[PDB]
């Protein structure tokens, strides 16, 4: 067992979060599975990634943000995720594991810029609590964010997948699923895309519940709204 | 002792390269030097960074790319840099040291998207050699790029500053200053910006040759062209 002779190309347009933290395993299995498939990848903001699929320069958009604004794409939920706050060992917050949004708003924040990786969930949580957060660094990825938390610039709020006990052993990782709604990373493609079989394999490798029949059903409805509703009774993986 | 009472804010808008690899030292010295200065930072593409300064949302743009296209900013050369190709130990290129541009064009390339971190230097080198490069991953930062070189997707070409023997010990780092022109990281700001003294200190910390008198002279010429010409007889640091 290993190798399929399938011949074609696969153009993935995605973001730093996905590429760094969610895709390497899938991408490695894929390339070893499909020696005759030309894999191309492109990194960008969620909006550029979406534009790229919509303009026809990529097959699939994978991101949390922006994707829903392009109903010329069919969107498929892949997983749910939430944030951690992250601080150096000596920070005041390092002492608890009890994170009120009012406690957090006391601190200067290193997080994502508007339009990136669940930022809208953070604004929502602060706005509905009345609060106005003090964000001193609006970054576009979590490698930058963790760097400047490490320098003592402020309190990090990143995707939980962006921190690992072995990779980032010098950071204290406090869970924040209490104070923020979860975010949903989706995959998008044009309806006019002929879905090769290596594509179905890719989609399902990334999101197990997105089997061919689920995908085809989803593709048939002329509504992203209906597609979201289709998964309402299904669990989703969480990263 | 150590500390200046200066009150004010400093808004820096920059990129992943700078923030990850060129700024942390400077930023740390600065914050400990200026307790009453509010440091703000924003990360983005070179173009968004430049727009940010031009629209007035940041004091300084620091990037290699795009900055020169905004002559409503004064641009100051900070340093020169060049690329390395990077591969896993087992790659064919790992054997030499190494590098004809014709040898490199034989391989699938993991590098920066057009518009990022000296990409235009790479295209230039290939185009003038007649060659057409096979780029399988167009990324926006070197963390992503190094990840997918590590998975064997292809041959990395990054900024030399983005690879370190201790941080990336599992990568073979071949020098490519022979085949590519150098790139120049610049700092930009509006003429209408009152340059506080903490600002001159920052500028000079980042680029020693950009002393106050050099900066003021540069600022007085109405020409970025003339400013570039001003440094024509000076060495520049290399990162």
């Amino acid at each position: 067992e290993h190798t399929w002779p399938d011949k074609g190309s696969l153009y993935i347009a995605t973001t730093h979060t996905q590429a760094r933290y969610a895709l390497p395993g899938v991408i490695k299995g894929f390339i070893e599975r499909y020696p005759r498939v030309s894999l191309h990848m492109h990194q960008g903001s969620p909006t550029q990634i979406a534009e790229a699929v919509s303009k026809g320069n990529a097959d699939f958009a994978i991101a949390t943000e922006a994707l829903h604004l392009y109903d010329d794409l069919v969107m498929l939920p892949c997983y749910h995720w939430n944030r951690s706050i992250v601080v150096t060992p000596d920070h005041p917050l390092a002492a608890t594991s009890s994170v009120t949004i009012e406690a957090l708003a006391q601190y200067p924040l290193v997080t994502y810029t508007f339009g990136f990786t669940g930022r809208s969930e953070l604004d929502t949580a602060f706005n509905r609590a009345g609060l106005t957060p003090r964000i001193v660094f609006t970054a576009t990825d979590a490698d930058v964010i963790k760097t400047y938390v490490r320098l003592g610039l402020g309190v990090g709020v990143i995707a939980s997948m962006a921190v690992d006990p072995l990779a980032d052993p010098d950071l204290v990782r406090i869970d924040a699923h209490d104070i923020f709604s979860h975010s949903t990373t989706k995959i998008g493609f044009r309806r006019s895309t002929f879905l090769r079989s290596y594509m179905y394999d890719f989609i399902q490798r990334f999101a197990p519940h997105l089997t061919r029949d689920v995908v085809d059903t989803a593709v048939a409805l002329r509504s992203n709204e209906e597609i979201e509703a289709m998964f309402q009774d299904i669990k989703l993986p969480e990263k």
Side-chain angles (χ1 to χ4, degrees), chain A residues 106-118:
Chain A
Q106 260 30 278
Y107 293 91
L109 304 183
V110 182
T111 199
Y112 306 104
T113 302
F114 164 85
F116 277 73
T117 319

Side-chain angles (χ1 to χ4, degrees), chain A residues 22-30 205:
Chain A
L23 284 161
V26 181
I27 298 286
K28 188 126 172 283
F30 185 90
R205 207 91 70 108

Side-chain angles (χ1 to χ4, degrees), chain A residues 21 48 115 119 128 148 207 209 224:
Chain A
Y21 306 129
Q48 296 170 332
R119 171 62 186 270
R128 316 223 246 228
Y148 284 86
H209 59 287
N224 290 317

Side-chain angles (χ1 to χ4, degrees), chain A residues 124-172:
Chain A
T124 300
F126 282 97
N127 188 69
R128 316 223 246 228
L131 310 175
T132 281
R134 178 154 90 273
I135 304 179
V136 293
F137 198 159
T138 44
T140 59
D141 59 84
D143 281 316
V144 178
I145 288 175
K146 288 184 287 172
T147 292
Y148 284 86
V149 167
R150 269 159 187 135
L151 274 72
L153 183 62
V155 172
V157 186
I158 53 186
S160 304
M161 25 157 168
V163 249
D164 151 71
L166 299 334
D168 313 277
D170 62 326
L171 286 177
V172 178

Side-chain angles (χ1 to χ4, degrees), chain A residues 205-221 223-233:
Chain A
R205 207 91 70 108
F206 188 61
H209 59 287
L210 292 180
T211 66
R212 168 192 292 259
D213 316 271
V214 172
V215 168
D216 289 328
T217 302
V219 168
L221 315 158
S223 149
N224 290 317
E225 220 185 288
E226 258 159 84
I227 299 182
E228 229 185 302
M230 179 193 320
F231 298 89
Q232 176 210 7
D233 285 335

